[PDB]
Amino acid sequence: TCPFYKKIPGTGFTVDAFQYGVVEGCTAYFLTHFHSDHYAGLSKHFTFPVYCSEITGNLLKNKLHVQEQYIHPLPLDTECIVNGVKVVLLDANHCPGAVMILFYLPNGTVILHTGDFRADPSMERSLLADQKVHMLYLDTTYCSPEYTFPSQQEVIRFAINTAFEAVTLNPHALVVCGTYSIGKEKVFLAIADVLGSKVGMSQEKYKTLQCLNIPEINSLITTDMCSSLVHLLPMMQINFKGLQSHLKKCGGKYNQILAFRPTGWTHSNKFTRIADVIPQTKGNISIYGIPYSEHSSYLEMKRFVQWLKPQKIIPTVNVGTWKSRSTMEKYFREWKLEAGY
């Protein structure tokens, strides 16, 4: 059964609610982005209207084989009427195709559902600037002050310089980058660009990348592994055993691997600056964990919410424990008292 924080009161609408069977009263199912925890339940047999971005739509059709007659793509930054209700989709600064949804309720209430997002000050100049929001359904993944990490730009700078240094010293080194979902594609695209290489990958991952509307993509990626010195592998294979095994397969073309595991936050963020990050190393294999986040840090979240001044906040992440819920409510009250709304 569908939890309360996935329902939009005063509408026939749900958000990210595909794992519950047929939801009573739901005339339109919204999908914020193509991450498995959120799409869980969709398939080629789904027969209710799905509303989403163009990119999310490409992935539903090609990867999950949802039939085309049930896919309803909407442009961003554009007022649209769905089942008699005005909605807008906004870029969430999460993974490709990820949106926030603004719902203009018939009674005058305005609701923002952030989906998953990485708050940015650029959002303060979107169509959010123009009016008041009564209810915020908020991505609270990192809602605690211990959660700090660098900008995505600093993280990419570190990776480009690390990869370019290693391969310039040793032209026979291979770079490997882990992946398990869409998102974070800047990591491997920036590295391959500095090395003058295409990114090599499996046919399944190439297919996913072809759904994402990335400009000039055919120039950037390939399924011919032997022509490429940046390879993508599943995240689970980014360990000394999996990488040893991969180096065997390359037929004595390479004699060193430098690998990247993009993670979210890890507790080594509580002590170590990005510049100071060092790898784990065994023989001719080195593995870097890099804190590339597609979710708000604590300070980015705080800034966004203090700017928006919602009347009520409903968390969508870390809602399963009393301790989490209590912690989160304390911070919302601080933010409100500090800013005066």
Interface residues with Ni ion (CB under 5 A) are 35, 116
| Residue with tokens 């209700």, as numbered in its chain | 85
- Would you say 6 or 35 has its CB closer to Ni ion? 35
- Chain centroid, CA 295 distance in Å: 7
The smaller minimum CB distance to Ni ion, of residues 91 and 193, is found at 91
Nearest to Ni ion of 116, 185 (CB atom) = 116
CB of 182 to Ni ion, least distance (A): 9
Please state, in angstroms and rounded to a whole number, the distance separating the CA atoms of residues 16 and 38.
Answer: 5
Closest to Ni ion by CB, 181 or 306: 181
Question: Looking only at Cα atoms, what is the longest distance across the chain?
Answer: 68
Residue keyed to tokens 């660009």 = 193
CB 53 within 8 A of CB 89: yes
100: nearest Cα among 178, 196, 33: 33
**Contact predicate 134/120, CB 8 Å:** no
Nearest CB to Ni ion, comparing residues 116 and 300: 116
263 contacts 162 by C-beta, under 8 angstroms? no
143 closest CA partner among 313, 14, 341? 313
**Min CB(118)–Ni ion separation in Å:** 10
Residue 110 CB, nearest distance to Ni ion (Å)?
24
Helix (H, G, I), strand (E, B), or coil: what is residue 102? Answer: strand
Nearest distance in Å: CB 99, Ni ion:
11
DSSP class of residue 198? P
Quote the CA–CA distance of 77 and 87 in Å, as a whole number.
Answer: 10
Q: How far is the CB of 222 from Ni ion (least distance, A)?
A: 27
Provide the token pair at 185. 């594609």
- Determine whether 286 is exposed, middle or buried from the number of CB atoms within 10 Å of its CB (0-12, 13-18, 19+): buried
Least Å from the CB of residue 326 to Ni ion: 25
- Minimum distance from CB of 213 to Ni ion (Å)? 18
The residue behind tokens 């940015």 is 120
Among 253, 258, 249, 252, CA closest to 281: 258
Toward Ni ion, which CB reaches closer, 34 or 331? 34
C-beta of 35 vs 261, nearer to Ni ion: 35
Cβ 6 to Ni ion shortest distance, Å: 15
Q: Which is nearer to Ni ion, 31 or 290 (CB)?
A: 31
Rounded CA-CA distance 12/23 in Å is: 10
